[PDB]
RNA sequence: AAUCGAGAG
DNA sequence: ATACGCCTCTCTGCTTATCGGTAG
DNA sequence: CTACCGATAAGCAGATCTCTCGATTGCGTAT
């Protein structure tokens, strides 16, 4: 099964506002274990297993002078199959806000499934 | 220093079935001693007499073996009991 | 000695007799919801 | 005990009452050529003395208004005369168990 | 559209007492979808592994029970038989879910001391222990369009699956298949309610139907043509074959 | 529910009858006044709907 | 032979103990955030009905 | 203060002995119902796993439920069944003079 | 219609039309004692059906 | 502290000072 | 709704949960349908009259009990029966009401329904076959008094539920009167 | 949280 | 840019209008 | 004769098992 979920990190800022976030690391207190499931411009490595807990994306938001992840939430484990870069439709050089991640979840057959 | 009857109602737990006065005595009537009671006025020295009350009236009180009304949800039994405590009035 | 204090400090005195039952929540929500609506209900303790 | 034809006024059944300690009551012509005891899906009725209605209620712990109610109007207590307070007996006849009887009340 | 008022928040089913006092979410509950299984004896259930970790029943520990409830504290709560959470005499909840060997084994230890403080020298620590085979759980399958629509059943712990396994007998009382149907199970967590289902909500008591007295409970298809097939003229079997069969259903030693 | 919490008391009936204004100001906390369920600063103010008064909001201490 | 595509694990749940809803201090709903399940009309009047009142409770 | 205490209890008492059925005129049934039977079990099950004496010998057992069982058995169980009557009466049957099945 | 006299309001408040079963409910004044299941459980209540029936009193013996 | 387990449900006097 | 509180008391008659009575006996013969069902099988029970001795266990089952009053008002009942019901039912009389109207059922051997009786007396009289007529009438009577619906059974839920879940396997309306 | 759609028994 | 003000196909009962019967 | 009633005709209020996923939730004025 293939899930796919967009993580638009632009969904508190909005018509030409400052950036509040960007898609990495900052220099805060953060523990390294992050790095595992997370390369270093905090988007996660293609082909990594992600369970619940498990580090999605990184950010740093200047505001809160802090590191921020976004976290798997589901159950079911999954791989990581890609990680898309999305651009917005201004066409001044701002950063990436858009993220697309599809994840790869195996359905093999157990018992209590239909056929 | 007077003597003030009392009419209580307790909580006897399960494990005291075999002394339950005994058992009224050490859960309530001992942590009473010492404190300023709101309801008799002061502080206790001491108790003498406690008595019981029967959840079947027909027993007549010459009777050793009362029954206690038991809570729905618990093992704990309820019923009311007489004690004469020993205040020290201020 | 009857008396007893607010969060805002203004002490008044008022009946200890107040008891400890074992209700549902939902019970304590509907009576809200009745105050609400200008209704009151008096639950009788069995023992007083 | 008054029969009437066809029908009554409201100077005549104004007066029902009005006449204690005695009782009168009121039945047409039409409508009684059937008795409506002899229909077999009416139970036998027998009015209950005092004497066992206290009896009956002592055994159950009953107050007079725990019962079953029959009617004042309906035709079975016009039947018998049967005043307020007093029970009623009735033999059911049961598919299942038979015979039993049950004791409704008019009030 | 309209903004509710008060008496929108009480009046229909989705109001307060149809939707929160006639009937409740609950807790110590779960659901899967029920296979078939012919090994359980039909007064039991198969629960899956899955639910045997997170269901837990508390039991107070007594002389009778540091045998098995310290085991189970032991074992923590991952290994089953096993215990989650440890309650202890003045109301303190300890959870073993982050706790190492050396301090399960510590507190296993210290399960059943003497209290120094006299104010709950009446009362004994508790110990929510998984949901073991002695235990007795309460299945249900909507629409319970009858009283036997939900039942008592004892527990009997899988190693594998994660659906609850059903003989085939509670079929005529369910109404149920096993083509994806889902039953609902409850896990009492008191002592009256582990005798009510043992007693009186039990399945064995559920033989006929109070609808009209006609029974409820029997094998259904394949076991039917199987007795057709035995039980005829033409069978015989052989000494090996003839005890084979009586040991195979019997079992002396359940 | 725990076992070993026994209850003493028991709702042995109940009544329905009205919530007079006279006692509803005698069982009150606070008045409310003013319409500022959240002012600036994103805080309840003093007196409002969402006060102190009507008990702990987020990480407030109920003023009551 | 198909394989459909209803699989078992997105329909089995279990919660002991979790989060409640606010007014009601009652389990929350839906499988995905540890909400319990409902014991509704029907299922209270079949634990009526056997007279079970402990289990009811 | 106490003497309107003490009228209440004498009230109360009075309509407990009223409603007191004695044991020469209890015309319930003999035996122990399903619910009675099910209902003491489970109560003495709690009376054992909080610390009650048990009056039989386990054979090393560790069910609550099994000893209240066990004790039903032997006929040790010191509970009362007080068998409410639709108007408030009642009458106290004791285990031992109930037989079960 | 069939139930409008009915000592217990709650069941039928529980039941439907809760507004108009409530008004005259508290028009009149009802105490209700807690006897339908349905009130027993609004107010949380061991049930009266059942092993609700009876009560049990234990018997010590000292 | 204080619950049913060590304080009365509810205490009251039957006779004045005696 | 209306039946939820609807249960069979401590004096075998049913009633509402308040205290209002609704029938003095559950069906009029207090006999429980869970139960029912091989009471008139009369040839199960008296070929299997050993095993059901053995289960009902009159040894144990008679000191608490009245053998006597029951067995001989339902003698009288029936001689009266006999004697009369060759005429309507408005005009006969109740010198003698049913034997279950007096005697508590589960305390008084012997009163039972007055067509479980009548029907036991027929397959007595017209089949006789070795152990007495006698034991295996006490049996059957034992069996009766055991057979009884127990107090609290809530019989208003149970009819609730029969007369609805039957329902819904009715309500396919193929093929004037509804 | 309301609706809309899709489905499972 | 941004804060104020706002929008075509059911089925039981209980309860009321309306322009005339109905005993004294 | 006169209230006084009343058999129509007409208006109005409420219901019509459990479960899992996703997608989307509004617009005119005026500083
Ligand atoms: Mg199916």
């Not at chain 9, 039941?15 to 459980?41: G, H, M, W």
Request: aromatic share 8%; hydrophobic share 35%; net charge positive.
């Amino acid at each position: 099964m293939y899930k796919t979920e967009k993580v638009d990190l632009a969904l508190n800022r909005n018509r030409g506002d400052p950036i509040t976030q960007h898609f990495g690391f900052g220099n805060d207190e953060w523990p390294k274990e992050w790095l595992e499931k997370l390369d270093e411009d905090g988007l996660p490595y293609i082909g990594t297993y992600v369970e619940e807990g498990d580090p999605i994306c990184a950010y740093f938001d200047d505001t809160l002078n802090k590191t921020k992840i976004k976290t798997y939430h589901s159950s079911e484990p999954a791989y990581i199959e890609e990680v898309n870069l999305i651009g917005d439709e201004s066409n001044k050089f701002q950063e990436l806000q858009t993220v697309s991640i599809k994840y790869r979840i195996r359905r093999t057959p157990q018992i209590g499934d239909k056929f | 220093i007077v003597r003030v009857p009392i009419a209580l109602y307790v909580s006897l737990a399960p494990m005291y079935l075999e002394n339950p006065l005994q058992g009224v005595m050490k859960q309530h009537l001992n942590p009473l001693v010492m404190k300023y009671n709101n309801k008799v006025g002061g502080v206790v020295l001491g108790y003498e007499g406690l008595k019981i009350l029967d959840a079947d009236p027909l027993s007549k009180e010459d009777t050793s073996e009362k029954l206690i009304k038991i809570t729905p949800d618990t093992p704990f039994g309820f019923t009311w009991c007489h004690v004469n405590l020993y205040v020290w009035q201020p | 000695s009857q008396i007893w204090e607010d969060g805002q400090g203004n002490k008044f005195v008022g009946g200890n007799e107040t008891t400890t039952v074992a209700i549902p929540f939902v019970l304590k929500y509907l009576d809200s919801e009745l105050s609400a609506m200008g209704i009151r209900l008096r639950y009788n303790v069995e023992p007083k | 005990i008054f029969v009437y034809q066809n029908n009554i006024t409201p100077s005549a059944m104004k007066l029902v009452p009005s006449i204690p300690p005695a009782t009168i009551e009121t039945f047409n012509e039409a409508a009684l050529v059937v008795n409506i005891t002899h229909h077999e899906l009416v139970p036998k009725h027998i009015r209950l003395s005092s004497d066992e209605k206290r009896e009956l209620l002592k055994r159950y712990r009953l107050k007079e208004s725990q019962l079953p109610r029959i009617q004042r109007a309906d035709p079975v207590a016009l039947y018998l005369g049967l005043k307020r307070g007093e029970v009623v007996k009735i033999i059911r006849k049961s598919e299942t168990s038979g015979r039993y009887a049950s004791y409704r009340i008019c009030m | 559209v309209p903004i509710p008022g008060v008496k929108q928040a009480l009046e229909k089913k989705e109001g307060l007492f149809r939707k929160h006092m006639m009937g409740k979410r609950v807790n110590y509950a779960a659901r899967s979808v029920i296979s078939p299984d012919p090994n359980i004896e039909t007064n039991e259930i198969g629960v899956p592994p899955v639910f045997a970790v997170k269901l837990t029943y508390p039991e107070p520990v007594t002389a009778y029970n540091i045998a098995e409830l310290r085991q189970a504290v032991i074992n923590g709560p991952d290994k089953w038989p096993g215990a989650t959470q440890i309650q202890n005499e003045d109301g303190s909840l300890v959870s073993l879910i982050g706790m190492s060997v050396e301090q399960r084994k510590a507190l296993a230890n210290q399960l059943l001391t003497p209290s120094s403080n006299v104010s709950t020298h009446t009362l004994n620590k508790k110990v929510y222990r998984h949901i073991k085979n002695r235990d007795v759980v309460l299945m249900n399958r909507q629409p319970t369009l009858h009283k036997a629509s939900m039942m008592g059943h004892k527990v009997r712990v899988l190693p594998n699956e994660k659906t609850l396994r059903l003989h085939y007998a509670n079929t005529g009382a369910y109404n149920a298949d096993f083509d994806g149907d889902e039953m609902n199970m409850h896990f009492p967590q008191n002592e009256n309610a582990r005798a009510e289902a043992l007693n009186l909500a039990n399945t064995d008591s559920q033989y006929l139907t109070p609808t009209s007295g006609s029974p409820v409970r029997g094998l259904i298809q394949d076991h039917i043509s199987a007795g057709v097939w035995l039980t005829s003229k033409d069978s015989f079997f052989t000494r090996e074959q003839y005890q084979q069969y009586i040991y195979g259903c019997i079992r002396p030693e359940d | 529910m725990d076992i070993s919490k026994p209850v003493g008391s028991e709702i042995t009936s109940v009544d329905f009858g009205i919530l007079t204004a006279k006692e509803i100001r005698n069982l009150s906390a606070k008045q409310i006044t003013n319409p500022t369920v959240l002012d600036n600063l994103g805080h309840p103010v003093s007196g409002g709907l969402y006060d102190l008064a009507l008990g702990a909001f987020l990480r407030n201490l109920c003023s009551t | 032979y198909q394989r459909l595509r209803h699989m078992v694990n997105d329909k089995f749940q279990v919660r002991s103990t979790g989060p409640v809803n606010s007014l009601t201090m009652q389990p929350v709903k839906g499988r995905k955030r540890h909400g319990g399940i409902r014991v509704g009309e029907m299922e209270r009047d079949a634990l009526i009905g056997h007279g079970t009142s402990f289990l009811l409770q | 203060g106490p003497e309107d205490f003490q009228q209440h209890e004498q009230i109360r008492r009075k309509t407990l002995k009223e409603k007191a059925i004695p044991k020469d005129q209890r015309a319930t049934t003999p035996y122990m119902t399903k619910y009675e039977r099910a209902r003491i079990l489970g109560t003495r099950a709690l009376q054992i796993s909080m610390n009650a004496p048990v009056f039989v010998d386990l054979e090393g057992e560790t069910d609550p439920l099994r000893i209240a069982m066990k004790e039903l058995a032997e006929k040790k169980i010191p509970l009362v069944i007080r068998r409410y009557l639709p108007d408030g009466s009642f009458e106290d049957w004791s285990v031992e003079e109930l037989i079960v099945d | 219609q069939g139930m409008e006299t009915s000592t217990s309001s709650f069941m039928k408040m529980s039941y439907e039309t809760t507004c108009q079963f409530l008004t005259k409910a508290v028009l009149d004044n009802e105490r209700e004692q807690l006897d339908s299941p349905s009130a027993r459980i609004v107010v949380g209540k061991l049930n009266n059906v059942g092993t609700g029936s009876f009560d049990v009193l234990a018997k010590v013996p000292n | 502290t204080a619950t049913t387990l060590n304080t009365p449900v509810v205490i009251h006097a039957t006779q004045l000072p005696q | 709704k209306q039946l939820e509180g609807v249960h069979v008391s401590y004096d075998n008659s049913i009633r509402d949960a308040d205290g209002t009575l609704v029938q003095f006996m559950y069906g009029g013969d207090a006999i429980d349908i869970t139960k029912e069902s091989h009471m008139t099988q009369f040839e199960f029970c008296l070929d299997n009259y050993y095993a059901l001795l053995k289960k009902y266990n009159p040894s144990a089952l008679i000191e608490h009990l009245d053998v006597e009053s029951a067995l001989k008002y339902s003698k009288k009942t029936l001689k009266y029966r006999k004697k009369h019901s060759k005429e309507p039912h408005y005009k006969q009389s109740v010198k003698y009401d049913p034997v279950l109207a007096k005697y508590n059922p589960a305390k008084y051997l012997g009163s039972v329904s007055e067509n479980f009786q009548d029907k036991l007396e027929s397959f007595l009289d017209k089949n006789s076959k070795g152990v007495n007529e006698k034991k295996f009438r006490a049996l059957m009577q034992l069996k009766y008094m055991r057979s009884l619906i127990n107090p609290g059974e809530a019989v208003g839920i149970i009819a609730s539920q029969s007369v609805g879940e039957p329902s819904t396997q009715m309500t396919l309306n193929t093929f004037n009167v509804t």
